[PDB]
Ligand binder design. Structure first.
Ligand code: BCL
Ligand code: BCL
Ligand code: BCL
Ligand code: BCL
Ligand code: BCL
Ligand code: BCL
Ligand code: BCL
Ligand code: BCL
Ligand code: BCL
Ligand SMILES: CC(C)=CCC/C(C)=C/C=C/C(C)=C/C=C/C(C)=C/C=C/C=C(C)/C=C/C=C(C)/C=C/C1=C(C)C(=O)CCC1(C)C
Ligand SMILES: [Fe+3]
Lengths: 299, 32, 38, 49, 306, 47, 38, 37, 38, 37, 37, 49, 38, 37, 49, 37, 37, 49, 37, 38, 38, 37
């Protein structure tokens, strides 16, 4: 009996029962990473276990270890709390400005944030290298780069633009929520921010699309069907079937767009805008309806 | 507020928007 | 030819309708003519 | 449907008859118990007045 | 035993309409398919249509009445118009004036009927096409959240005012008001679990889409065929995700992962929303008693002042 | 009173441990199924 | 023939039920009959 | 023929019902007839 | 035939259950009958 | 022919109905005629 | 036959359980019986 | 299904009969313990009043 | 047979355990028994 | 057979461990025994 | 199916009988220890009062 | 040719319309001419 | 056999380590022994 | 399974008996040390009282 | 054999290093030794 | 061979460098030595 | 050989440059030398 | 040879560019040179 990838055992195409070892050995092909093109050789061009280690893998692992050490030190020492749900890792005060001093408190927040940034960029570059070794596209790096740009907006661009550097988030479990709540209520009705609304729309659409795609694929896995049943099912309900290649494109685009608009709204709310209720005071004054009402229906 | 630095950071954010736009343009240009 | 007759007709009719509605609404809201109870 | 009665043969199977009988007895016992419980609850505190 | 031509090209009730398919063109260029195609109508969907549009007509007519029947003001204030439920007095009574919550009850009833009939439509068409019925249960898990929001939570609190007011801006206001009323949902554990599942769902969707698009040069998007025998694209995707994080899946497990993320999101959200008001009147106080609230003696408050 | 309340115990620490163990177990079994031997197209012939 | 008996029956039944429910709701909410509440 | 009997019947019935409901609602809301209190 | 017995049974049962629930809720929430402590 | 009879009929009917509704609503709301109280 | 025994059993059991739980919770929340204080 | 009685042969299997017997005995013991516990709790603190 | 033994056993066990936990929580939360320090 | 040995052992062990930890923590938090100060 | 008794042959395997015996003995010992611990705790401080 | 006639016409017409609308609206809002009261 | 030796070893070792860490943390957090100030 | 006893042959391999012996000896030593530690800790400061 | 030498060495080394770091950090945090100011 | 020489060298070098960085940073931040402006 | 000469050259040069940049940055941030008004 | 001359030239030029940009930025950001006033 031939075992299928789903799990079926169907008695008996050009397929055959092949162990994963043959596939793993066949596709190694060392010597095509990004660092090899630049320097002419990759210093770390091997595998340690199941992982591939490259030039940026070492940088990422160093950043990870250093960041975790600094995070634990600020929270076990200098706070004396001993539990992780009550830790509160703060940046330097707003009065200090854009400068950093080891003597003053908030230095290890700097160390952890820098190490985390280095680790994130190293992970992105490692993903690019692994994609380039397999002759694939560069789509996953684009999505992860959207996420990393979302991080850089919150921790680098906004504090520099506002110029005091106390405007970055504390790295504490259950405590970054305090920062989110206070920032959101400082610019009251953060719902009324247009880009926040677009981001929420994209998030909800992404979840709905994921559920629909999972249901559709799972509904035909282990049945004797002609591969066109799903198209008829999706045209009978809603009167449209996107196809096999369109659903993944839509998923990738929606996922990236949500985070992009979210980082745009956070940065814009930081500097160029002060109140999101006053932002809509232009609407009722446009010269198409500013003179049509009376009493409570005026304006 | 220093309006030069803020505009520079805004330009960086709009640059960060670019790769998805490039992917959309590539998908449109191919598949004629 | 650069454009088809159908597209030109559609664009022209839509532009005319939107402009007429917009001008009527602006004149009504201006309150400068004493029309329909001032 | 050998054990099924003549009238209900087109609607029931042989194995389904026994399960249906079990459900019928369960419903009848539950109804008797519920009637008793309602009578005691009314005797304790009326809910209409 | 299923003829797709019949299921797509019947006539009358229990058949389809819009029979001559359309074509859009740019959707064919960008998404790979641009057939509008026919749409089924089978007595599960006529009821949904009629009930949904009855509810919409009621809401729109109330919107018109609220502005004095002025169309220009109707366009002016469309996005900040709403039809709120009855006030907190006379909690669950239906003897209410039409302008004081009478229309909200009728519209909500018709909307409930519409959503239930839509679920029935989904289930019946899944059965009639030969595919499984996973989509019906996913929609059931979202209707669970919907019914907690609109029916089961206002019940057990004693008033209709605990429900949203049927408006573009009214849902945002409802979210803010419910957060302020019951403490802070940032300290609601089920809100935390729902956020975890939601962000995980978005992450998984992005990863899967990028992975399939990257390996589409070897026909990796044909999920139905890859479940029979793996191809070069699926092999490359497995190798990529094994070399990145040390473990991977095949082209069948990822769909189970996605389905369960979405289902858990909906279910945990419903449970948290229901538990918010009846048992824990204040989430911050509960968090303080549970030792999940960080001490905060000496703030630096200059960040939060203009 | 150095200890949390019972409701805190349940509502916080039961779901968290459940999620952690479930994630680890599901990942382990997904990897087991993925790396098993089944039908595949030969990479040497397949291009 | 333009319409089937099924479609006519379904549409008529749904319209009647919806109209009856709406009329009953409106009459109850108006409070002009002294019924089911003072 | 440009239009079929079915489409015309459906459109006319929907338009008539919508107009009648709208007119009754506007007349009731105006409060100028002393109907339903 | 126009309709199956199955569909008629299902629709009738569901409509009856929904109407019973709605009528009970409307009548009891009116506060006009003194049921379970007024 | 650039346009069909069906499309022209549909567009004209929709435009006329919408314009009539809009004009009646504007005239009623302006309160300049003493109609319907 | 129109309906299978299994579907009827499932629907009856679910309806009965839901009604029992709902009625118990409604009676307990009414607070008109002096039950559990 | 050799050990299964004649009446329940279409419903039960030789392996499931033993497990069913185990479950029935367990439920019987549980019911006895539940009745004893309820009587003790009523003797300790009545809940109807 | 309409139902397998496994389905019955699983449903019964799950229902029993859930009911036991819920009843214990509801009884002990009422504070009407003086159990484990009131 | 309806159930296999491994499933029974796994379910029993998980339930026992969960109940034991929950009961110890509830008893400790209740503060009704004078245990660990 | 050689070390298993005749009654439990359809349900038990020759390798799982030993594991079942180990589990049974462990459960018995745990139950005895739990009973002793409960008695000692009651003698120390009653939890019902 | 590097660019088509159609694209040039579309871009030019759109830019002209947008510019004219913007300039009329800005001049109206400036309140510098005594136009429309 | 139902369970392999490696699975039993992994489960037992992980459970023992986790319980030891948890018990040490709880005893330290109780503040009832006068250990580590 | 030449070195495994006859009773435990169906359950144990030849290379696993040695590892099992090592684990058992380690657990016994751990139990003895834990007993001593508990005795000294109780002698220092009782935790029940 | 159930476990390889390499896996045992890796697990033991990681556990020892993590335990050493944790113990040093906890002892430093407790402030019961007068070490490092 | 249980391990390769290059893996041992790389792991040792990374661990040593990380430890040296961490120790210098901790000692500098503790301010217990009067080094680099106290 | 376990390592190639050019790989060692790349690793050593990169590590030295990174360490030099880090040491200048840390010394400047300390503000203990009066360098660039510090 | 261990390193191609082209690669050395490219690496050196890029390193010089990055160093020049970074040093200009740091020197201009300092308190002594206030962005050339
Ligand atoms: C009252 C004085 C107001 C004012 C009020 C208005 C209003 C109100 C309108 C204009 C419109 C226009 N105004 Mg003026 N306007 C003012 C001052 C100016 C000044 C100026 C420098 O002062 C200028 C340059 C203009 C210039 C213009 C033009 C852009 C335009 C008229 C020409 C046109 O397009 O005809 C071409 C027009 C057509 C070809 C329309 C043909 C329509 C056909 C005949 C159908 C009619 C409906 C009929 C019922 C259909 C029946 C059959 C069924 C369909 C089967 N106005 C002042 C401030 N002006 C009109 C316009 O069209 O704007 C877009 C308009 O509506
Ligand atoms: C405000 C002062 C008066 C008042 C003044 C008027 C005036 C004035 C008039 C009415 C008219 C009507 N009034 Mg009034 N009315 C008042 C109060 C009420 C009250 C109430 C609760 O108080 C009610 C229920 C009504 C009810 C009604 C209707 C009987 C009637 C409009 C019918 C309609 O919708 O036609 C539109 C309906 C349709 C277009 C649909 C027809 C469908 C057919 C009948 C069924 C088969 C459909 C078929 C199968 C479909 C096939 C195609 C499908 C696509 C498959 N009035 C008060 C007291 N009323 C009108 C009238 O007399 O009408 C005759 C009218 O002119
Ligand atoms: C108290 C007085 C209240 C009021 C309270 C209620 C309530 C409460 C209810 C009704 C219901 C109805 N009311 Mg009344 N009603 C009032 C005034 C009116 C007025 C009026 C004054 O004009 C009218 C016309 C009506 C008309 C009606 C009918 C639509 C309906 C009863 C007949 C029916 O449909 O039987 C047909 C009904 C059946 C065939 C049902 C048969 C069900 C079988 C017996 C099983 C029942 C369930 C049981 C648990 C099963 C147990 C065993 C398990 C299956 C194993 N009411 C006043 C205001 N009325 C009932 C109804 O059914 O509404 C939909 C209902 O629930
Ligand atoms: C009372 C005075 C009000 C006013 C109130 C209204 C109202 C109210 C309306 C108009 C309408 C119009 N007004 Mg006027 N109007 C005013 C001032 C003006 C001024 C001006 C410069 O002052 C102008 C230029 C206009 C111009 C116009 C036209 C665009 C239009 C009428 C012609 C038309 O379209 O015929 C062509 C019209 C038709 C061919 C209609 C045919 C309808 C068919 C016969 C069906 C009728 C319904 C019937 C029940 C069907 C029954 C059977 C069922 C189908 C089965 N009005 C003032 C402010 N005017 C009407 C219009 O249609 O606007 C779009 C309209 O509704
Ligand atoms: C509130 C007043 C009283 C009180 C009043 C009562 C009363 C009254 C009763 C109980 C009952 C019980 N109480 Mg109490 N109880 C009190 C305080 C406590 C405390 C405590 C720490 O204070 C505890 C731990 C308990 C514990 C318990 C349980 C022993 C028992 C319910 C068991 C159960 O879940 O059955 C349900 C369990 C199941 C349905 C699952 C069974 C599963 C079996 C055991 C294993 C199967 C394994 C196999 C592999 C599974 C196969 C299928 C799988 C799906 C694969 N009580 C207080 C002091 N308690 C009940 C009782 O006595 O029951 C006998 C009862 O009626
Ligand atoms: C009143 C004095 C105001 C002012 C008010 C305005 C207004 C108001 C407008 C301009 C516009 C313009 N102004 Mg001026 N302007 C001022 C001072 C200046 C100064 C200056 C340095 O002081 C400059 C350089 C300009 C320069 C300009 C040009 C950019 C432009 C006119 C030419 C053009 O581009 O036509 C290019 C455009 C065309 C050739 C369009 C031709 C369209 C044809 C005629 C059709 C029109 C519609 C018609 C109804 C169609 C009917 C038929 C149907 C389609 C079948 N202005 C002052 C402050 N200016 C106009 C403009 O169009 O800007 C873009 C404009 O609307
Ligand atoms: C101080 C008094 C405290 C207390 C403090 C602790 C602490 C602290 C711990 C326990 C632990 C335990 N306690 Mg006590 N305990 C108290 C009261 C109780 C009561 C009671 C009813 O009063 C009970 C029933 C128990 C019962 C128990 C057991 C659950 C457990 C020891 C059994 C075991 O697994 O041994 C077998 C133990 C082993 C097999 C461990 C073997 C470890 C091997 C030898 C390695 C050791 C590390 C070494 C550095 C390795 C070096 C070489 C390299 C690996 C190469 N304690 C009071 C409240 N108890 C201990 C435990 O093991 O928890 C899991 C534990 O850590
Ligand atoms: C100061 C007194 C403190 C305290 C502070 C510490 C600190 C601090 C540490 C320990 C550690 C340990 N403590 Mg003590 N400890 C205390 C009280 C106790 C009590 C008790 C009940 O009172 C117990 C049971 C223990 C028990 C233990 C052991 C688990 C462990 C030491 C043995 C071991 O595992 O070695 C196994 C370890 C090894 C064999 C490591 C061998 C490393 C080799 C020699 C290399 C070293 C690095 C090398 C120089 C780097 C450069 C290499 C280049 C190639 C040149 N401590 C009190 C509260 N304890 C230490 C430990 O290792 O924990 C895991 C540790 O770090
Ligand atoms: C100031 C006093 C501080 C303190 C400050 C420091 C600092 C600062 C450091 C240490 C380091 C160490 N400390 Mg001390 N230390 C203190 C107290 C202690 C105590 C104690 C019980 O109190 C102990 C046990 C230790 C123990 C240790 C060791 C783990 C380690 C030194 C040995 C080593 O690794 O050799 C083995 C070391 C090597 C083999 C290194 C070989 C390096 C080669 C020769 C290259 C050198 C660099 C050079 C620039 C290269 C140029 C290349 C170009 C191509 C030319 N410290 C107090 C609190 N300690 C050092 C360390 O290595 O931490 C990881 C370190 O950096
Ligand atoms: C608050 C207010 C005002 C509310 C408004 C008031 C209203 C609207 C009330 C509506 C009430 C209704 C509609 C109640 C409905 C009660 C029902 C349907 C109970 C069903 C019992 C089903 C039962 C007992 C079924 C039992 C099934 C059993 C015993 C199955 C057994 C078995 C079966 C069949 C198998 O395969 C094999 C296993 C086994 C042998 C055990
Ligand atoms: Fe897919």
């Amino acid at each position: 009996a031939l075992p299928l990838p789903s799990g079926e055992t169907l008695p008996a195409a050009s397929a055959e029962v092949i162990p994963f070892s043959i596939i793993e050995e066949f596709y190694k092909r060392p010597g095509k990473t990004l660092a090899a093109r630049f320097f002419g050789v990759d210093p770390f061009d091997f595998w340690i276990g199941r992982f591939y280690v490259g030039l940026f893998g070492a940088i990422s692992i160093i950043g990870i270890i250093l960041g975790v050490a600094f995070y634990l030190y600020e929270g076990v020492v200098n706070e004396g709390t001993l539990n992780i749900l009550a830790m509160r890792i703060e940046p330097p005060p707003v009065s200090q400005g854009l400068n950093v001093d080891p003597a003053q408190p908030g230095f290890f927040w700097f160390l952890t944030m820098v190490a985390a940034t280095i680790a994130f960029v190293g992970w992105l570059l490692r993903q690019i290298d692994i994609s380039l070794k397999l002759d694939m596209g560069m789509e996953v790096p684009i999505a992860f780069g959207a996420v990393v740009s979302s991080w850089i907006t919150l921790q680098w661009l906004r504090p520099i633009a506002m110029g005091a550097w106390g405007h970055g988030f504390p790295l504490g479990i259950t405590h970054h929520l305090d920062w989110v709540s206070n920032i959101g209520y400082q610019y009251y009705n953060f719902f009324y921010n247009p880009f926040h609304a677009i981001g929420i729309t994209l998030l909800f659409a992404s979840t709905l699309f994921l559920h629909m795609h999972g249901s559709a694929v799972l509904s035909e896995a282990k049945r004797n069907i002609s591969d066109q049943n799903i198209h008829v099912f999706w045209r009978n309900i809603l009167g449209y079937s996107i196809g096999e290649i369109g659903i993944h494109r839509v998923a990738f685009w929606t996922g990236a767009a949500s985070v992009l608009f979210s980082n745009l709204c956070i940065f814009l709310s930081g500097t160029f805008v002060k109140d999101w209720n006053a932002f809509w005071g232009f609407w009722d004054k446009m010269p198409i309806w500013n003179g049509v009402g009376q009493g409570a229906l005026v304006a | 507020m220093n309006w030069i630095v803020a505009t520079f950071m805004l330009m960086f954010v709009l640059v960060a928007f670019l790769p998805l736009v490039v992917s959309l343009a590539y998908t449109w240009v191919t598949n004629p | 030819r650069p454009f088809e007759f159908r597209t030109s007709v559609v664009v022209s009719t839509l532009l005319g309708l939107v402009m007429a509605l917009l001008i009527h609404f602006v004149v009504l809201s201006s309150g400068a003519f004493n029309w329909l109870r001032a | 449907n050998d054990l099924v009665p003549d009238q209900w043969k087109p609607l029931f199977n042989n194995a389904q008859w026994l399960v249906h009988d079990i459900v019928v007895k369960t419903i009848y016992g539950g109804l008797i118990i519920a009637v008793i419980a309602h009578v005691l609850c009314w005797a304790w505190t009326p809910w209409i007045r | 035993p299923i003829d797709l031509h019949d299921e797509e090209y019947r006539d009358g009730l229990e058949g389809t309409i819009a029979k001559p398919p359309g074509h859009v063109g740019w959707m064919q260029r960008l998404l790979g398919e641009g057939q509008v195609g026919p749409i089924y109508v089978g007595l599960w969907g006529v009821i949904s249509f009629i009930t949904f549009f009855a509810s919409a007509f009621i809401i729109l007519v109330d919107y018109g009445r609220q502005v004095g029947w002025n169309p220009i003001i109707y366009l002016r204030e469309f996005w900040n118009l709403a039809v709120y439920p009855p006030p907190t007095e006379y909690g669950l009574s239906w003897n209410v004036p039409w302008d004081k919550g009478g229309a909200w009850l009728a519209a909500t009833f018709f909307l409930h009927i519409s959503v239930l009939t839509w679920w029935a439509r989904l289930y019946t068409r899944a059965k009639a096409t030969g595919v499984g019925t996973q989509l019906a249960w996913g929609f059931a898990s979202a209707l669970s959240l919907y019914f907690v929001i609109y029916l089961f939570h206002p019940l057990a609190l004693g008033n209709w005012s605990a429900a949203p007011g049927h408006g573009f801006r009214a849902i945002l206001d409802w979210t803010n008001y419910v957060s302020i009323h019951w403490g802070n949902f940032y300290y609601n554990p089920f809100h935390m679990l729902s956020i975890f599942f939601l962000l995980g769902s978005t992450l998984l969707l992005a990863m899967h889409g990028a992975t399939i698009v990257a390996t589409s040069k070897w026909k990796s998007e044909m999920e139905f065929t890859e479940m029979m025998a793996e191809g070069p694209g699926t092999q490359r995707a497995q190798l990529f995700w094994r070399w990145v994080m040390g473990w991977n899946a095949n082209s069948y497990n990822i769909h189970i992962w996605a389905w369960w993320f979405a289902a858990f999101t909906a279910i945990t959200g419903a449970i948290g929303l229901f538990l918010s008001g009846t048992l824990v009147p204040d989430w911050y106080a509960w968090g303080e008693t549970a030792k999940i609230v960080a001490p905060w003696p000496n703030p630096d408050w200059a960040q939060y002042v203009f | 009173s150095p200890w949390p309340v019972w409701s805190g115990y349940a509502l916080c620490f039961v779901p968290l441990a459940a999620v952690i163990l479930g994630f680890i177990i599901a990942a382990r079994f997904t990897d087991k199924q993925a790396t098993s031997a089944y039908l595949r197209l030969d990479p040497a012939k397949a291009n």
